[model samples]
Target chain A: KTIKIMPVGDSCTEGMGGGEMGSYRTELYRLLTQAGLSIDFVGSQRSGPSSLPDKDHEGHSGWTIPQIASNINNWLNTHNPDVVFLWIGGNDLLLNGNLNATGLSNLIDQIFTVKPNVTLFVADYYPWPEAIKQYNAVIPGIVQQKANAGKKVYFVKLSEIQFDRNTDISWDGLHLSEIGYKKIANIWYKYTIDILRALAG
Target chain B: KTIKIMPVGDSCTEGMGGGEMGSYRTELYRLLTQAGLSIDFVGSQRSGPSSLPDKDHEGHSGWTIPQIASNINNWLNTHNPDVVFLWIGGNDLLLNGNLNATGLSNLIDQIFTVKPNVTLFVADYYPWPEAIKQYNAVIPGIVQQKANAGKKVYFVKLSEIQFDRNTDISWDGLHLSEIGYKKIANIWYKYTIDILRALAG
Candidate 1:
């Protein structure tokens, strides 16, 4: 049986920052194909940064964590993916400033209710210029909390891998470049396949 | 003339995460080969929770930015590579906690000084646990500082590209899995070829 994977989030999922096809997803697909794995890749992403349609629709750009929680159900119903890759909170932090761990966790819990059987992969957002301390402070606890809650939730911490002052940022200073995307794709590919292999066994 | 490309960094550079010999590098090389750019890839990497000592006397398990910096000149001297593909600093943050940005920038400056003529393709470190915000926070500015200094440095931010928390992390929660590595390799392949072509011109 082929494992179906769905990527959900903002510009990152839409492959906005890198190249035209979203370097990360495109690269992951290439790797999976090379490995000869039967996996179906799907994209459930939008162009605007924020998660809230109302806010994102306004072209406000960069949604907050609360906005994502508010509209996540729609994403679930629409995508109904077997595996959901969630990358939220960047725009939230950018727009609203500071990361609200409790509020973000609440959003994760709400997402779980929508798709109980689906394995949720929660990304640890990067350290932004304004809220770096707060962002790093809260993500690990959030990951551990979900893992402890008996949800098939896993955390992919990327801060360390992409820390090189070079090649990490795009011209916008917020988005990632193609090289940056490649580093992330490398880490995610390794983790995802292992998780799938474990589940298969 | 065959372009000699050396990937020096952590396990990802060494092809530890898994896929194929050039899972990541090979993909890049294939692109170059297809483009009719003769290229050879050389790698030096190792896997551990932290940075290792380049010289046995340092007694480090994994490599840190400082350690990598110390040996970079010698490595370049010995290898005499035309271009260098660097993917370091993950273990630095993973084991040593947040590293000072100024120090990292200085380290990079020193490396470039040694190989002023070599084309440097630098990747932004990936997203890691939130605890590493300090290290992540200072990177972009430092990268920009170096670019402003007129060094031929290119930054490829990877956080968002590898933002698929669901598929990006491994069970060990430290290293990248196969898929993650492949994604990174593909991006490097595509972009590096373009950069190399530009440089050759």
Candidate 2:
């Protein structure tokens, strides 16, 4: 059976750095298929390379966790995914100066309520604003608490993915460059293999 | 994050005819790393190829659910895995005509009680005896019930994997041949990639 995967979150997920054909999703999809895995990327929002077979995702530019949460139920119900990649929260810190862990946790609860069996991967933003560092610090603890309690959720440390602010950031000084998106894809790929292999066998 | 995985079960999990490294795990591990995912296979028992990096598992040949249950707590507490692959109940059914969903369900409950956040994958065996079919019939319902309740559990339909009873079975007509193990590995891989990919990211 093919696995249904939903890429959920904000502009980073929407490929603000990479154009329509350049989202990190393009490389991620390639990596999965190159390894001979069967998968279907699902969601209401769509982007990525035209050559990329499954382009569906749930990335909304300039959106926060609350924004994504409002529509998460619809997306999960509509896509019926087995797994979800959540890289949200950047806009919350950027726009409101709030970490908003409470909102994120509530959203996570909603996700489990809708699809109990779905594996969710939540990532912290890379080194951006000073608040970004503080925001990233809160992510792992919250995610680990869920993991400790038996939820199929994991924390992805995008901050750990090496990015030279000088070289990685886009011309606008906000989004990632093509090189940066590739690095993000590598990190996402790094944290995801265990679930992939477990599902594989 | 490097995901910790525990493989749990009976002789099949112990890799009966596949001899040490001959288990389906060997191929499974290969597929994972070949795709570049970091993972640690953890368990109390160890086998598989001497060269195979992580050989730990919880497979006890000839052990029934009660037998495994007696020590499951110790293993779970010690290993503290993020993921668990459960392919049990064959011994229970073979030893007693009962489908033993009660024992299996109880075992699952015990698992969650200890580690509420672990992702558990339960598999139905390949088509074997007349009793096997009836036994497999009960698996999905129990697993789906857990899923509905927000447990990170999934039902893997191994019976769906095509197998020639004559050639796929070993000389004993009980265990699987090398070909059979490979087929089993394939199906396991199929049902597992969603979790894997999500974890990858």
Q: How does chain A of every candidate compare to the true chain A by TM-score?
A: 0.81, 0.94
| Regions of model 2 farther than 4 Å from truth | B1-201
TM-score of each model, paired residue for residue: 0.45, 0.49
TM-score of 1: 0.45
User: Could you give candidate 2's per-residue lDDT for residues B108-180 as a string of tens digits?
Assistant: 9999999998889999998886568888999999999989998999988889978798777764466676678
TM-score (second chain) of model 1? 0.78
Per-residue lDDT of model 2, residues A150-176, tens digit only: 999988888987779877886546678
Q: Worst 10-residue stretch by lDDT in candidate 2 chain A? A: A14-23
C-alpha RMSD of each candidate structure in angstroms:
18.4, 23.1
Which window of ten consecutive residues has the lowest lDDT sum in model 1 chain B?
B49-58
